[PDB]
Structures are given as structure tokens and as C-alpha cells.
């Protein structure tokens, strides 16, 4: 299914994903299009920060949902 | 009367309200339809964040007005 990931700068990333994809998998798909490593990616949906262990289905993320991507600096 | 609340996900929520409803009442009605706790709701109308102890009438929110909902983490 298709989902959208919006950065805080207004840019929209389109991904192909399955309900059983984990948040980490979703982050790796963002890495394939943008180059952003999963460890710098914070995903939000409906006022909740998404956890790497959980799946899209766990969060009730359905077709054509929008996730919000927040980028973070690398500590080192 | 009917008012509308728009979320930033594109959804419109329709509520049945009266002019004497307080902002808290409105937030509780949003909780009944969406499950969002009042303490995570910020309602925006005419450039203002709406305050809990005031009524729709106080803000001149009339039939078929649209509020915008912002969610806290």
C-alpha cells in the first residue's frame, strides 16, 4: 500500500509498504529514497511517536496515511 | 447548531453544539468522536487559541464555523 511521509520542511516522500512492515523497515525505505539513516529518523503519526519494534498495523496506519518525519543530529 | 473541526490530517469532525458550550465541552465532544484527550487538544479559531473557561458565544463562533485542531505529543 501507499503511504506518505512529510518532513517538517513540507517535502513529501511517497513509499510502498505493507501493514506488517515494522517502523524500522519504513525508516529503511526512507533511507533508500533520501539517504537518511534510520538512527536519525523520528516518525510521528496522530500525535504519537512511532516505536521501532511496532508495525504499521499496530498503529492503525492505513492506505494513504501521512507520517511526519523529524530529523535529528547524530551524537557521534 | 453544527460546527466543524478540521484536523491537519484532512479530516473534518462535525459536532452538535450550542452557543453556551464552553471550550472544555467542545474538547470533550472531540474526545467522544476521536478519542483524543482534552489535555492534548489545541483549538484554533480566528487567529486565537481558544481558552477552556470561555464559551463559543464569547468567541463569536456561529453555526457552520470551522475550528482547527492541533495535537500535542
Amino acid at each position: 500500500m501507499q503511504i506518505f511521509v512529510k518532513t517538517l520542511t513540507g517535502k513529501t516522500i511517497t513509499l510502498e509498504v505493507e501493514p506488517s512492515d515494522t517502523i524500522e523497515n519504513v525508516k529503511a525505505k526512507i533511507q533508500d529514497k533520501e539517504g537518511i539513516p534510520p538512527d536519525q529518523q523520528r516518525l510521528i503519526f496522530a500525535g504519537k511517536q512511532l516505536e521501532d519494534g511496532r508495525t504499521l498495523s499496530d498503529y492503525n496506519i492505513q492506505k494513504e496515511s501521512t507520517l511526519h518525519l523529524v530529523l535529528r543530529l547524530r551524537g557521534g | 447548531m453544527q460546527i466543524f473541526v478540521k484536523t491537519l490530517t484532512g479530516k473534518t469532525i462535525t459536532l452538535e453544539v450550542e452557543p453556551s458550550d464552553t471550550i472544555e465541552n467542545v474538547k470533550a465532544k472531540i474526545q467522544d468522536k476521536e478519542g483524543i484527550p482534552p489535555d492534548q487538544q489545541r483549538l484554533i479559531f480566528a487567529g486565537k487559541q481558544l481558552e477552556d473557561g470561555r464559551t463559543l458565544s464569547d468567541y463569536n463562533i456561529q453555526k457552520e464555523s470551522t475550528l482547527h485542531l492541533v495535537l500535542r505529543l
Binding site: 523529524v70 | 480566528a46 495535537l71
Partner: peptide
Amino acid sequence: LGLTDLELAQQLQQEEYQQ
């Protein structure tokens, strides 16, 4: 106030998401 409420709401949601 036209699009004021939408554009303000979007910016605010965003501020919330940066927290």
C-alpha cells in the same frame, strides 16, 4: 481571516512535533 487558521495550525502542529 482566510487561510490564517490553517497556516497557523500547520505551523503549530509542526512546533509540537519538534518537541
